[PDB]
Amino acid sequence: ATFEIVNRCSYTVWAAASKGDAALDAGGRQLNSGESWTINVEPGTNGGKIWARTDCYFDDSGSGICKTGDCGGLLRCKRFGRPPTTLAEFSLNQYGKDYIDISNIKGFNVPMNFSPTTRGCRGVRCAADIVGQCPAKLKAPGGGCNDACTVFQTSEYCCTTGKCGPTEYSRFFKRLCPDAFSYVLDKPTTVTCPGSSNYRVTFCPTA
């Protein structure tokens, strides 16, 4: 499958794409305002994620730091990124279907649209100003809005026992972005697409 990742934000982002233990495609790339980067994702990929990183500095060998979404200091991510990260999540070719979603379970940093470029399913979007509105205790100094589990490390926020309810903090993400997971037992906003669809991830879709 083919993903076009386009950066509509007015700032530079460093896109990243990984399935947890390995990079998808090159795994990472600088995108200036307006730049598009297209990648090949192998069919059958389970739990691939795409996200943006902000205020990065890398050297010639591709080692550095990002204020949000850092993946162990590397330009080409092979593990997942440090929160806060708005997440495009996808599993492809699962019994002939593709499943996609946007997640705030690991916080928010960049508004995002996740849509197919082929026929037969809707896209999802989380484009509200969650950093501007972030509750005082969830603001990450590096920019962005942390999830409650990252901040507080309680069983209720992290849902570690498998049973948890919505929280004051998760209800905030759900109210600004209904189409995204706000906590791990949230009512699924997963969208089912024909298997082997193709997609576009757009950062800052509105402004």
Quick one: CA torsion of 188, 196, 77, 153, rounded to 10 degrees? 10
Counting every residue, how long is the chain? 207
Q: Under CATH, domain 1-207 is a member of which superfamily? A: Thaumatin (2.60.110.10)
Strand ranges (DSSP E) for 32-162?
A: 36-40, 48-58, 64-68, 87-94, 97-103, 112-116, 124-126
One-letter amino acid identity for 64?
A: G
Identify whether the C-beta of residue 113 lies closer than 8 Å to the C-beta of residue 137: no
- Spatial distance between the Cα atoms of 24 and 76, rounded to a whole number of angstroms: 9
Residue found under tokens 């492809």: 92
Residue found under tokens 């950093």: 131
Q: What is the DSSP letter of 74?
A: B
Q: Which of 149, 14, 138 is nearest to 69 (CA)?
A: 14
- Spatial distance between the Cα atoms of 127 and 178, rounded to a whole number of angstroms: 11
- Spatial distance between the Cα atoms of 165 and 87, rounded to a whole number of angstroms: 21
**How crowded is residue 40: how many other Cβ atoms within 10 Å of its Cβ?**
11
- Spatial distance between the Cα atoms of 7 and 52, rounded to a whole number of angstroms: 9
Structure token pair of residue 98: 């593709």
- Spatial distance between the Cα atoms of 113 and 10, rounded to a whole number of angstroms: 16
Identify whether the C-beta of residue 169 lies closer than 8 Å to the C-beta of residue 157: yes
List residues bridging with 191 in a β-sheet. 100
Distances (CA, A) of 125 to 5, 34, 83, 105: 14, 19, 19, 15
The 3-state secondary structure of 112-143, one letter per residue:
EEEEECCCCCCCEEECCCHHHHCCHHHECCCC
SS3 168: helix
DSSP strand pairing (48-58 vs 191-194) = unpaired
Identify whether the C-beta of residue 126 lies closer than 8 Å to the C-beta of residue 108: yes
Breaks (C-N over 2.5 A) in the chain follow: none
**How crowded is residue 101: how many other Cβ atoms within 10 Å of its Cβ?**
19
Beta carbons within 8 Å of 107's beta carbon, 6+ residues apart: 83, 84, 85, 86, 138, 140, 144, 145, 146, 147, 150
One-letter amino acid identity for 118?
A: T
Q: What is the resolution of this structure in A?
A: 2.7
Q: Measured in whole angstroms, how far is the alpha carbon of residue 50 from the centre of its chain? A: 5
- Spatial distance between the Cα atoms of 86 and 103, rounded to a whole number of angstroms: 6
Experimental method reported for this structure: X-ray
Where are the domains positioned within the chain?
Answer: 1-207
SS3 169: helix
